[PDB]
Design a protein around this motif. Structure first.
Motif, PDB file in Angstrom:
ATOM      1  N   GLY A 169      52.242  40.362  35.505  1.00 19.15           N
ATOM      2  CA  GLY A 169      51.072  40.351  34.644  1.00 19.15           C
ATOM      3  C   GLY A 169      49.767  40.017  35.341  1.00 19.15           C
ATOM      4  O   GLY A 169      48.993  39.188  34.861  1.00 19.15           O
ATOM      5  N   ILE A 170      49.505  40.649  36.479  1.00 14.87           N
ATOM      6  CA  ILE A 170      48.234  40.514  37.182  1.00 14.87           C
ATOM      7  C   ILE A 170      47.546  41.867  37.188  1.00 14.87           C
ATOM      8  O   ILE A 170      48.178  42.890  37.484  1.00 14.87           O
ATOM      9  CB  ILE A 170      48.408  40.026  38.629  1.00 14.87           C
ATOM     10  CG1 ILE A 170      49.372  38.859  38.696  1.00 14.87           C
ATOM     11  CG2 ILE A 170      47.068  39.596  39.203  1.00 14.87           C
ATOM     12  CD1 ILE A 170      49.852  38.605  40.061  1.00 14.87           C
ATOM     13  N   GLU A 171      46.258  41.869  36.870  1.00 13.83           N
ATOM     14  CA  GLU A 171      45.416  43.014  37.166  1.00 13.83           C
ATOM     15  C   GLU A 171      44.877  42.867  38.586  1.00 13.83           C
ATOM     16  O   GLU A 171      44.383  41.798  38.969  1.00 13.83           O
ATOM     17  CB  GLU A 171      44.276  43.140  36.153  1.00 13.83           C
ATOM     18  CG  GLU A 171      43.834  44.591  35.947  1.00 13.83           C
ATOM     19  CD  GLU A 171      43.163  45.185  37.183  1.00 13.83           C
ATOM     20  OE1 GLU A 171      42.052  44.726  37.514  1.00 13.83           O
ATOM     21  OE2 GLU A 171      43.749  46.089  37.829  1.00 13.83           O
ATOM     22  N   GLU A 172      44.986  43.949  39.360  1.00 12.92           N
ATOM     23  CA  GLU A 172      44.652  43.909  40.779  1.00 12.92           C
ATOM     24  C   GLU A 172      43.200  43.495  41.012  1.00 12.92           C
ATOM     25  O   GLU A 172      42.901  42.764  41.963  1.00 12.92           O
ATOM     26  CB  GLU A 172      44.931  45.275  41.407  1.00 12.92           C
ATOM     27  CG  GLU A 172      45.121  45.212  42.917  1.00 12.92           C
ATOM     28  CD  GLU A 172      44.514  46.401  43.651  1.00 12.92           C
ATOM     29  OE1 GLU A 172      44.551  46.411  44.901  1.00 12.92           O
ATOM     30  OE2 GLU A 172      44.000  47.325  42.985  1.00 12.92           O
ATOM     31  N   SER A 173      42.284  43.933  40.158  1.00 14.93           N
ATOM     32  CA  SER A 173      40.892  43.576  40.398  1.00 14.93           C
ATOM     33  C   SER A 173      40.594  42.120  40.089  1.00 14.93           C
ATOM     34  O   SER A 173      39.433  41.716  40.220  1.00 14.93           O
ATOM     35  CB  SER A 173      39.957  44.474  39.590  1.00 14.93           C
ATOM     36  OG  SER A 173      40.105  44.220  38.210  1.00 14.93           O
ATOM     37  N   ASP A 174      41.594  41.330  39.675  1.00 14.21           N
ATOM     38  CA  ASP A 174      41.437  39.885  39.543  1.00 14.21           C
ATOM     39  C   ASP A 174      41.801  39.133  40.816  1.00 14.21           C
ATOM     40  O   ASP A 174      41.435  37.960  40.943  1.00 14.21           O
ATOM     41  CB  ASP A 174      42.284  39.344  38.385  1.00 14.21           C
ATOM     42  CG  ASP A 174      41.581  39.454  37.041  1.00 14.21           C
ATOM     43  OD1 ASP A 174      40.333  39.406  37.016  1.00 14.21           O
ATOM     44  OD2 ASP A 174      42.275  39.578  36.009  1.00 14.21           O
ATOM     45  N   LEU A 175      42.500  39.779  41.752  1.00 20.33           N
ATOM     46  CA  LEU A 175      42.872  39.154  43.016  1.00 20.33           C
ATOM     47  C   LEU A 175      41.652  38.969  43.913  1.00 20.33           C
ATOM     48  O   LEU A 175      40.941  39.934  44.200  1.00 20.33           O
ATOM     49  CB  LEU A 175      43.909  40.015  43.726  1.00 20.33           C
ATOM     50  CG  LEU A 175      45.154  40.308  42.893  1.00 20.33           C
ATOM     51  CD1 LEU A 175      45.940  41.427  43.520  1.00 20.33           C
ATOM     52  CD2 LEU A 175      46.001  39.044  42.797  1.00 20.33           C
ATOM     53  N   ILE A 176      41.429  37.735  44.380  1.00 18.77           N
ATOM     54  CA  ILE A 176      40.230  37.410  45.156  1.00 18.77           C
ATOM     55  C   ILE A 176      40.284  38.066  46.534  1.00 18.77           C
ATOM     56  O   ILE A 176      39.372  38.803  46.932  1.00 18.77           O
ATOM     57  CB  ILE A 176      40.063  35.887  45.279  1.00 18.77           C
ATOM     58  CG1 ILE A 176      39.938  35.222  43.895  1.00 18.77           C
ATOM     59  CG2 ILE A 176      38.884  35.550  46.170  1.00 18.77           C
ATOM     60  CD1 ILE A 176      38.954  35.872  42.956  1.00 18.77           C
TER      61      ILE A 176
END
Lengths: 177, 177
Positions: free
Chosen positions: B60-67
């Motif tokens: 449940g991660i959206e890639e554009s949330d990864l720093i």
């Protein structure tokens, strides 16, 4: 609220070896062509949920593939899986101290046979009389076989049934996770 | 093939702190209301994908949330996120040694105000003339501000823009992940 206390959880990977652990659980995984549960030592079963924050590789998992059930604080992880086995809802979870171990019970043999019975509750390798059941089967589990080393002896994974012994005269787990 | 070398990855959680590490990356996260990126130290940048087998909390991660971007070996993890910030595709990834730090650059202050300009390439806190730019803003990011400590000084996250200085007279990153 349903979540296990994360203050005492410790999870680590390096290279090909990993462990999920807390006060009572030591859950080892290894990379052998693919990641798989290697062994586990469980001291006191609990019913909380292992938080994903403290879990490796939590995505793309079928709950029914986790060896240690979610309801018994099994990590929701590809590291808590093993090819040919599904969740051990009816493992011998009554035992105070438990070892999950991929090795045949002493004095026993397990054959992979389409003719075998279906998964039922975990059976112990010795009768109440104490007699060792030699021949077991599973329909499509992998070798070496999932086994549980408990206080009262050795138990087999849900997949693994006596090959010819009538399932009646054996000791079985009355726990359901 | 696309994947970073796992023989060298060490990832561990204990309590409220975790680290995803390898030969060149040291990525720390902490539980502080939520799990969030705390700091990272990157010796040399690389382009491979960090395997999920060696990653905590990958679902449940959206890639554009990864720093740290996926393409720059950023772990696909909630531990690689920070509220109010999105993937730093245009961070100053050219720097040798590099430290991600949630702290204002020296002599600078950052204001949260919707009137700020939108995000763009990372800017350094000092002009080419070496002059410190005091006032910065971001539209909706959180404090303390995301900054990068490099060999040539202090840079700001993509969301953080000069308040009044015209971005033209500043050093931009020429890098895209």
């Amino acid at each position: 609220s349903l979540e296990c206390d994360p203050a005492v959880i410790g999870t680590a990977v390096k290279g090909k070896e990993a462990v999920h652990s807390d006060l009572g659980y030591w859950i080892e995984s290894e990379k052998n062509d693919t990641w798989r549960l290697k062994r586990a030592h469980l001291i006191e079963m609990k019913t909380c949920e292992w938080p994903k924050s403290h879990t490796l590789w939590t995505d793309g998992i079928e709950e029914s593939d986790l060896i240690i059930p979610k309801s018994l604080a099994g990590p929701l992880s590809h590291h808590n899986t093993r090819e040919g086995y599904r969740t051990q809802m009816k493992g011998p979870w009554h035992s105070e101290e438990l070892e999950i171990r991929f090795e045949e019970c002493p004095g026993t043999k397990v054959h992979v046979e389409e003719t075998c019975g279906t998964r039922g509750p975990s059976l112990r390798s010795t009768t109440a009389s104490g007699r060792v059941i030699e021949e077991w089967c599973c329909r499509e589990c992998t070798m070496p076989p999932l086994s549980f080393r408990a206080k009262d002896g050795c138990w087999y994974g849900m997949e693994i049934r006596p090959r010819k012994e009538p399932e009646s005269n054996l000791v079985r787990s009355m726990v359901t996770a």
